[PDB]
mmCIF file of C-alpha atoms and ligand atoms in Angstrom:
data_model
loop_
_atom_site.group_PDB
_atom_site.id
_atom_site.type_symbol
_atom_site.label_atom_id
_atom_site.label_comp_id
_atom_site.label_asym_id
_atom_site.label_seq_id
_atom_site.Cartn_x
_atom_site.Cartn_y
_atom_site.Cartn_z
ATOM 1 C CA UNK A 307 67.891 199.268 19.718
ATOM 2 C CA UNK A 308 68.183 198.942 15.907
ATOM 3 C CA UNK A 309 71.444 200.413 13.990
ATOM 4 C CA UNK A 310 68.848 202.790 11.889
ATOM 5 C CA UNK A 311 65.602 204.660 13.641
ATOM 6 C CA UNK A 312 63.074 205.878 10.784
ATOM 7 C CA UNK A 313 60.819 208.539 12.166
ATOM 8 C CA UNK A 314 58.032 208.821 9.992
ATOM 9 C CA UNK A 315 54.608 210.886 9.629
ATOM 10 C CA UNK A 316 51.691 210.299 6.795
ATOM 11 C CA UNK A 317 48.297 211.408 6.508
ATOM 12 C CA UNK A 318 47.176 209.330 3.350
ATOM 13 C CA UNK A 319 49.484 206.418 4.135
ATOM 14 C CA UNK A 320 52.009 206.700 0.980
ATOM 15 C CA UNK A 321 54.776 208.407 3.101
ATOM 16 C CA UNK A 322 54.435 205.348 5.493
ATOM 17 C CA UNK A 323 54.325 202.647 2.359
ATOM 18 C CA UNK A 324 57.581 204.264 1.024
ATOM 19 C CA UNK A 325 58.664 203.893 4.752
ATOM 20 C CA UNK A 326 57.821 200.025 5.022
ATOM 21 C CA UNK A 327 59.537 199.482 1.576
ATOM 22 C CA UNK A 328 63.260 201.330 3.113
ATOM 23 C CA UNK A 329 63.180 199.078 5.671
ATOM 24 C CA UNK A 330 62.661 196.267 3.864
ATOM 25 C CA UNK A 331 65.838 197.049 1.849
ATOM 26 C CA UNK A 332 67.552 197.956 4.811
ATOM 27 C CA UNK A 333 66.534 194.436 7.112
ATOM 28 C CA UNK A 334 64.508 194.406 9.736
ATOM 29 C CA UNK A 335 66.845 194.101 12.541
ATOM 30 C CA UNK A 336 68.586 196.981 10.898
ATOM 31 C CA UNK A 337 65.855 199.693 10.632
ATOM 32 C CA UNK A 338 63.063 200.036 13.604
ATOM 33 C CA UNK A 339 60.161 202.622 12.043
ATOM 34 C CA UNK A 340 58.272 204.922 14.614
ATOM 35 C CA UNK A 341 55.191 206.479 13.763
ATOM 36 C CA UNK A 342 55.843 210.268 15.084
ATOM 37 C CA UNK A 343 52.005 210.307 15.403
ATOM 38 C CA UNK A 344 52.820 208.269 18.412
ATOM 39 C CA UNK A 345 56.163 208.903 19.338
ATOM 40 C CA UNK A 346 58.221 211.183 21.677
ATOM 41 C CA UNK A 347 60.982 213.147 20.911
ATOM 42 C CA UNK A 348 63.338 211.037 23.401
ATOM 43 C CA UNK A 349 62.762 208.374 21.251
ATOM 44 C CA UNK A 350 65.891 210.020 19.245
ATOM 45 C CA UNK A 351 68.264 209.330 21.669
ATOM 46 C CA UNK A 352 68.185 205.400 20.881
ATOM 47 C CA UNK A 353 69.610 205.995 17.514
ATOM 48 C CA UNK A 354 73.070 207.442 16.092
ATOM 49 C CA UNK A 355 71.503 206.653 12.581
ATOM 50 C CA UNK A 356 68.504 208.460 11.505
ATOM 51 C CA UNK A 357 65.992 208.528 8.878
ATOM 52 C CA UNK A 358 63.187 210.808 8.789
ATOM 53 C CA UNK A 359 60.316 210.819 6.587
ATOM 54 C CA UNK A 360 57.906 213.402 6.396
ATOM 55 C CA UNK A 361 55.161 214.395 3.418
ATOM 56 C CA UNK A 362 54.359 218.010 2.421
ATOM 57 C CA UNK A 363 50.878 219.261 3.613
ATOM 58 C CA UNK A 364 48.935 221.884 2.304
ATOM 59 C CA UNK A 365 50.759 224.115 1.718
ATOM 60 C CA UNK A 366 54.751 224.238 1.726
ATOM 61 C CA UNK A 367 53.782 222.788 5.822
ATOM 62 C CA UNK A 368 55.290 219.907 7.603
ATOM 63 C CA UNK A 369 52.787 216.542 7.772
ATOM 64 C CA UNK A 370 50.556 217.441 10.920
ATOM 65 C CA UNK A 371 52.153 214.792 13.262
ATOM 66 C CA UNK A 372 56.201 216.089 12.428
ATOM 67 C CA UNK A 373 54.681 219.319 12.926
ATOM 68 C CA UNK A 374 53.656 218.829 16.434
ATOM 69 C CA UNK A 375 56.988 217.141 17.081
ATOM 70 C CA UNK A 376 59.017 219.734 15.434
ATOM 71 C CA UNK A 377 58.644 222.179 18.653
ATOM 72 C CA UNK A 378 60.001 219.762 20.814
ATOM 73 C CA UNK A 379 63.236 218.788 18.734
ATOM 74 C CA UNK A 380 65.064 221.497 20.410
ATOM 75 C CA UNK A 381 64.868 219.267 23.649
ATOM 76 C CA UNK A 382 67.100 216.441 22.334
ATOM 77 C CA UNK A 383 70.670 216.922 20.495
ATOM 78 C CA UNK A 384 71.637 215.196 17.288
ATOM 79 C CA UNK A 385 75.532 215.411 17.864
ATOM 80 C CA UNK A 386 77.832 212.514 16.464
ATOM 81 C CA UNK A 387 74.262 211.662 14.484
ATOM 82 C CA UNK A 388 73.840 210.917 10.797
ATOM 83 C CA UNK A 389 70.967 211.663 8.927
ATOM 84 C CA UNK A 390 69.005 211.130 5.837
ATOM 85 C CA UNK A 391 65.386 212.525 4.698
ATOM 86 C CA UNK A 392 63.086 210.929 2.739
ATOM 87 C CA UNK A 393 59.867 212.559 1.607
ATOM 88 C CA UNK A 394 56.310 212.008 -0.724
ATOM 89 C CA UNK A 395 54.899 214.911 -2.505
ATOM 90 C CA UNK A 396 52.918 216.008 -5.896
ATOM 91 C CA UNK A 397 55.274 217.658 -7.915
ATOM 92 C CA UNK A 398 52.551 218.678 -10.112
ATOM 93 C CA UNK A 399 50.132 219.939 -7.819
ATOM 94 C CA UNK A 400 52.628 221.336 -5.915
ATOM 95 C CA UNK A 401 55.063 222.800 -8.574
ATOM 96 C CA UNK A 402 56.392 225.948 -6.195
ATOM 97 C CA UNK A 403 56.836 223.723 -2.793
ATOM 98 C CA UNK A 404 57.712 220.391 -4.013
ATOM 99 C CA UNK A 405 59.188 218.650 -1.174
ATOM 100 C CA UNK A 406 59.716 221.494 1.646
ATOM 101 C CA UNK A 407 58.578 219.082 4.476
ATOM 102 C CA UNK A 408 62.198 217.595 4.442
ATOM 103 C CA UNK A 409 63.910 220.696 3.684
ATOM 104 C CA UNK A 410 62.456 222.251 6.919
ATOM 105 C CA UNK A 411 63.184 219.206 9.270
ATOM 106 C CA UNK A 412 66.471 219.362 7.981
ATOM 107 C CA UNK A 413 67.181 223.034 8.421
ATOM 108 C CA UNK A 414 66.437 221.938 11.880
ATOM 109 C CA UNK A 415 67.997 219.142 12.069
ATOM 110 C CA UNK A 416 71.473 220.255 11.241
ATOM 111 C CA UNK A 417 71.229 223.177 13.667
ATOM 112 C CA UNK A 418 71.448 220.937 16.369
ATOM 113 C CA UNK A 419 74.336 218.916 15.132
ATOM 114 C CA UNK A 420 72.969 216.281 12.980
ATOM 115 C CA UNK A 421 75.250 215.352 9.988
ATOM 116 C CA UNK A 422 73.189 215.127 6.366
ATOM 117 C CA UNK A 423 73.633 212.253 4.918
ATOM 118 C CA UNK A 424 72.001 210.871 1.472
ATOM 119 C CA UNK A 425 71.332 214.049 -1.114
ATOM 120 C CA UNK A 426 69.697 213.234 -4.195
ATOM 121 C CA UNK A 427 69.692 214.280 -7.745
ATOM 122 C CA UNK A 428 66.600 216.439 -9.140
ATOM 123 C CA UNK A 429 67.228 215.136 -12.094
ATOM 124 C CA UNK A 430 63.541 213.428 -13.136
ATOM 125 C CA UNK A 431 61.722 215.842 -11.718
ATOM 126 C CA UNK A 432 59.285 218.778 -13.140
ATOM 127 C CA UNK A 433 58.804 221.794 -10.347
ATOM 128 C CA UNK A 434 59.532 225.394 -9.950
ATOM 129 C CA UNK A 435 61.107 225.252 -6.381
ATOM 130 C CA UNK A 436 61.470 223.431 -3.111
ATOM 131 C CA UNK A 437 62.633 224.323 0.434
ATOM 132 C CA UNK A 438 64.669 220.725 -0.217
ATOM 133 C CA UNK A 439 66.894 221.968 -2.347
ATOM 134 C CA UNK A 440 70.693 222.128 -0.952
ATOM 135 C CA UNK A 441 73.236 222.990 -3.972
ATOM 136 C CA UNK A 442 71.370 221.850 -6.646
ATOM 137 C CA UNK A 443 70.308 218.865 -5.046
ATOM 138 C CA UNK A 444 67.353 217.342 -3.117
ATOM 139 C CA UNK A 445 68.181 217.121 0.893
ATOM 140 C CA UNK A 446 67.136 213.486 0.825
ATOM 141 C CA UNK A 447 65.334 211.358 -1.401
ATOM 142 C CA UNK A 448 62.109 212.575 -3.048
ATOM 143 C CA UNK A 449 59.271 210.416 -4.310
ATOM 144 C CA UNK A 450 56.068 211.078 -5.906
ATOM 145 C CA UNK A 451 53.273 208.501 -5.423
ATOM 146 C CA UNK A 452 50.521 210.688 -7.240
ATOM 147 C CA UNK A 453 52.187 211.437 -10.585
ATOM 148 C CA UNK A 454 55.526 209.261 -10.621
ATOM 149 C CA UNK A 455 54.438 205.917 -8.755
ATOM 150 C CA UNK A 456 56.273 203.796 -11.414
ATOM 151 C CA UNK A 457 59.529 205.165 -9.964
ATOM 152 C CA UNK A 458 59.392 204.521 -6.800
ATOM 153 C CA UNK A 459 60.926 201.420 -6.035
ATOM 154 C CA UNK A 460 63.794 201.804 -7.956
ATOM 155 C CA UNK A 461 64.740 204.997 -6.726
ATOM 156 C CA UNK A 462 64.200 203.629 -3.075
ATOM 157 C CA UNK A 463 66.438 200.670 -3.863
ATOM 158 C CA UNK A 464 69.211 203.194 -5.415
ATOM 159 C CA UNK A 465 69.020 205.638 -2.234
ATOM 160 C CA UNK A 466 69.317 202.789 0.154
ATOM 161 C CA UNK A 467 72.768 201.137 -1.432
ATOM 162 C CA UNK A 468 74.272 204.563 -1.423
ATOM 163 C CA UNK A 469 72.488 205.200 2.028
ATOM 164 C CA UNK A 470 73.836 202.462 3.277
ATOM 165 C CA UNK A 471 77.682 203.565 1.729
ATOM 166 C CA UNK A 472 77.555 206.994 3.566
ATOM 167 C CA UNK A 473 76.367 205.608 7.004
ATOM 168 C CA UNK A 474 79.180 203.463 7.010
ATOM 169 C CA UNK A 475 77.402 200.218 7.691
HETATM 170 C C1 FMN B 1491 45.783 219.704 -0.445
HETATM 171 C C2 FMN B 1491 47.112 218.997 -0.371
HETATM 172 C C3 FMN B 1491 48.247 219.801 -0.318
HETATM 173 C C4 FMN B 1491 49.470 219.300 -0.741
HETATM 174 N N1 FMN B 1491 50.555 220.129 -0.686
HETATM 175 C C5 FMN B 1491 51.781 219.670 -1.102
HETATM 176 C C6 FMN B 1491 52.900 220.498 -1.067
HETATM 177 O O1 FMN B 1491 52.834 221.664 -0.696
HETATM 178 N N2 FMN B 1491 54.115 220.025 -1.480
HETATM 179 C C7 FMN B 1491 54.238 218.733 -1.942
HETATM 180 O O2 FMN B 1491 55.329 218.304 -2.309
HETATM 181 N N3 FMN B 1491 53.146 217.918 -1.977
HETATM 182 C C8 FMN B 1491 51.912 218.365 -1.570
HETATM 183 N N4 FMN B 1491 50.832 217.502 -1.611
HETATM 184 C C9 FMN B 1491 51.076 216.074 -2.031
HETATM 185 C C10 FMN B 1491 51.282 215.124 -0.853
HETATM 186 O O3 FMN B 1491 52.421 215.482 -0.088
HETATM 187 C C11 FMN B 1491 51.434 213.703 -1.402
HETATM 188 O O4 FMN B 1491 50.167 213.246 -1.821
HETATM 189 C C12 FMN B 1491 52.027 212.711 -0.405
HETATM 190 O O5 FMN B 1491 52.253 211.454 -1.031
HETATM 191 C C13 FMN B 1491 51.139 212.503 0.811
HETATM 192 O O6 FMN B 1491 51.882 211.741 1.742
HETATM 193 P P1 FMN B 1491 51.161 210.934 2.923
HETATM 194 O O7 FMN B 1491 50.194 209.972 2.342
HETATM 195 O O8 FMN B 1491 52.239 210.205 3.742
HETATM 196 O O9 FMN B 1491 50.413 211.924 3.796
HETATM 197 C C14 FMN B 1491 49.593 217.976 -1.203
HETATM 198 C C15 FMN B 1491 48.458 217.175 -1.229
HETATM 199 C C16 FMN B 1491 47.226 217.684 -0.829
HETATM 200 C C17 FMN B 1491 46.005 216.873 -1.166
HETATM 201 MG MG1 MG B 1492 62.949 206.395 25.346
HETATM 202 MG MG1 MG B 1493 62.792 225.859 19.432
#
């Protein structure tokens, strides 16, 4: 298996664009990307590097397809496991749950052992509140396709070199 195992969901595709473009900066012998539309929950267990990718559905809800999959995370441990979050939402549309898909999959996440790894700056940003927020910071990286397109590269290509830093590879 791959060093890196990005677990992603998308309804409108943009979550899964921003997910092609992270493992482009990443290599792709480095990061393999699964779907979580079609993939099981076992499929964790190849990978002591995680990154999971998940929009926020109407409203403040977890992307239909991480949804059904969130149930089942309690089957698998994420000991010894580091993890970053990367998310799409509309920040204007969405002012008072800006990015809680993350948040909640992290909440999760870290219950059963996994490590956080990759916190961003809200800095940029115009919302009232988010489930993501950890400290004054974003849980992982937060993009906005709909209203802040024109960013999104760059802030990919800044998460992934410090990404990169805190995984260790
Ligand atoms: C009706 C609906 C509800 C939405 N609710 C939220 C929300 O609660 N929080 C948020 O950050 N974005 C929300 N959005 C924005 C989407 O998360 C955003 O368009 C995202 O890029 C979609 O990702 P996807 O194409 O991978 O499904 C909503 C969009 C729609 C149309
Ligand atoms: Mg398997
Ligand atoms: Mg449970």
């Amino acid at each position: 298996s791959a060093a890196i195992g990005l677990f992603y969901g998308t309804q409108t595709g943009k979550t899964e664009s921003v997910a092609e473009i992270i493992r482009d900066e990443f290599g792709n012998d480095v990061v393999t990307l699964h779907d979580v539309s079609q993939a099981e929950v076992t499929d964790l267990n190849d990978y002591q590097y995680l990154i999971i990718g998940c929009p926020t559905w109407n409203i403040g809800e977890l992307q239909s397809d991480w949804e059904g999959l969130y149930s089942e995370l309690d089957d698998v441990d994420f000991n010894g496991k580091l993890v970053a979050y990367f998310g799409t939402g509309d920040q204007i549309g969405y002012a008072d749950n800006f990015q809680d898909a993350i948040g909640i999959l992290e909440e999760k996440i870290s219950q059963r052992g996994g490590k956080t790894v990759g916190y961003w700056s809200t800095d940029g940003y115009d919302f009232n509140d988010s489930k993501a927020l950890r400290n004054g910071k974003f849980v992982g990286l937060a993009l906005d396709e709909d209203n802040q397109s024109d960013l999104t590269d760059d802030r990919i290509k800044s998460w992934v070199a410090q990404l990169k830093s805190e995984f260790g590879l």
